[PDB]
Amino acid sequence: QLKIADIADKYVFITGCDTGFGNLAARTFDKKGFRVIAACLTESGSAALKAKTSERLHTVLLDVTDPENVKKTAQWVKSHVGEKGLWGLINNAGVLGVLAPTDWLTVDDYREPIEVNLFGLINVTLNMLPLVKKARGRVINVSSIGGRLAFGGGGYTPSKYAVEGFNDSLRRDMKAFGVHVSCIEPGLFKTELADPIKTTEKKLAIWKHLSPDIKQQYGEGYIEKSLHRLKSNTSSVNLDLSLVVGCMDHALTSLFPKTRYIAGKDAKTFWIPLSHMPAVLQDFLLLKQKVELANPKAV
Amino acid sequence: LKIADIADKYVFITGCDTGFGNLAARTFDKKGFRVIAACLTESGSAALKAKTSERLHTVLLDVTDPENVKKTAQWVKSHVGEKGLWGLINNAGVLGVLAPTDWLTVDDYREPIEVNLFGLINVTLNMLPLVKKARGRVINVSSIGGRLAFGGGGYTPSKYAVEGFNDSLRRDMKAFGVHVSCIEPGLFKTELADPIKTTEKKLAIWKHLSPDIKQQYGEGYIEKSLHRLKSNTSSVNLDLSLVVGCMDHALTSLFPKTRYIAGKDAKTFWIPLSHMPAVLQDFLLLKQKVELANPKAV
């Protein structure tokens, strides 16, 4: 294979490096000899990341939903990289948000995941884009199988579908500047994103204030019956985060970066294939394992 | 065959002032449905009332106003009583600012996402108990723009998002016998997409654009891009009834489809192109795009 040269002279900006993919990426690209700028949400996230990495790495406190903070951070990066520009932007920061049946939710429940996963990713992209153009560099967007195949109710799937759409508008707009745009679609991975207990604890808070009608339709025990089911399929979840960082690595360092990478044997052989199937067949296969409502005719 | 007792069934349609929503309100009124036509403007609803039977009611709805949506859902709940709401057609939408991504701020993305996604979701969540009651139909108007990305701006993200929400809703509602249909129109002559309106927004943005971007694209880029939009306004459907016919099948068929494609453009070019890898989409979609004056001026 043909890799790029002068990795040591190139800067990579990564969002959400406190935990998960972003943290392993910051550490992996620091070892590789890139100059990493690791955006962290929390002081302890950045202190633990600094403590584990070389002097080539800098950390910045970034909340991607704070437009002043994003603009300041882009100003800082612009001074520091000067005429090298910014070789690599990895939009990794994301949250699950509330995940529940659609008919349990209000529109406000949809706001948080869209604000981080879409608006935050867009604003960071628009603020760094002049620097990535300058370097003729790489924008890497972290999507989800949830951006090709809808999860249950909540803003996560809409936010990820939207990222897929923005990613393609950006790729086509940037082809003229020699800037490559790569979309990464991970399967299910053990990170801090998706915590069966955290997810069940949010469903229970919603249940507490849910109308009598919905409670009668689903039935008492629905939440706990559907946790016994989530836990039946927690074995088939990747613990190897490097399958995703390897994809970021190829998108950063390959002379021929792919427009889409799929991480996880789950994703390559089940989820993405299922995303190409007509809805009749997706609904058939996805609904086979769903908890029966107590009183569906109580409408 | 078709359902029975069309005359006993209510259909709520958003954005009936103009375009698909207007033709749908009129077509379903003629068909003998009891239409509740949500209009953005007083003059939109006065002209719609004036052209339709006494079976039709109009309500003033801004889908981005959550108080207005909740009030309208209360009004509908009283009026349909125990029939519930047989049909919800989420039709209301706007294009927003359409321009190269590197011209835009995040704020430019907000309006189309607020109408096309948040507005559609909030109207859906407020009417859903009534649609469950009727064991009825939710019909979401997407776009080829929700399967294949248009230029920069929030329209394509909003439409991709609708496609995602549509599938979450279909799967959540299968247990209540509620069917969910997604309509993907090609390009149609409505008030949505107006080459002159689109060019007039690009020019206002140009006026405040950084020296760097202006050098890269070059003076005349916008006007060269209008000469090109106007070269391909022949290949734009004038027959809005191709879309309302799809809504009709989704409302009245015992076997409503999960997705309808309207336009010969959409069936034979756009949707096929949406299944191709990016190398091939970018090849075909970029062939006809205005060369930048100084792309290396970065």
Ligand SMILES: NC(=O)C1=CN([C@@H]2O[C@H](COP(=O)(O)OP(=O)(O)OC[C@H]3O[C@@H](n4cnc5c(N)ncnc54)[C@H](O)[C@@H]3O)[C@@H](O)[C@H]2O)C=CC1
């Ligand atoms: N782990 C999985 O199974 C899947 C993960 N993904 C995506 O991978 C990306 C990374 O998440 P994971 O590493 O899995 O989880 P994680 O929660 O461990 O990492 C997400 C990161 O986002 C940061 N973050 C959250 N809100 C932020 C904000 N407002 N501003 C700045 N940073 C913020 C957190 O500090 C954290 O470092 C996300 O975009 C997620 O949607 C994709 C598909 C599924």
Ligand SMILES: NC(=O)C1=CN([C@@H]2O[C@H](COP(=O)(O)OP(=O)(O)OC[C@H]3O[C@@H](n4cnc5c(N)ncnc54)[C@H](O)[C@@H]3O)[C@@H](O)[C@H]2O)C=CC1
């Ligand atoms: N016309 C086309 O070629 C295409 C249209 N579509 C979709 O068709 C749908 C209907 O639009 P068209 O009839 O084509 O355009 P249009 O502009 O003629 O109709 C849109 C309707 O939405 C209403 N509306 C706009 N903002 C609103 C708000 N905040 N609250 C309530 N109502 C509001 C307007 O009053 C109007 O009646 C849209 O969702 C659009 O995205 C799909 C693909 C392309």
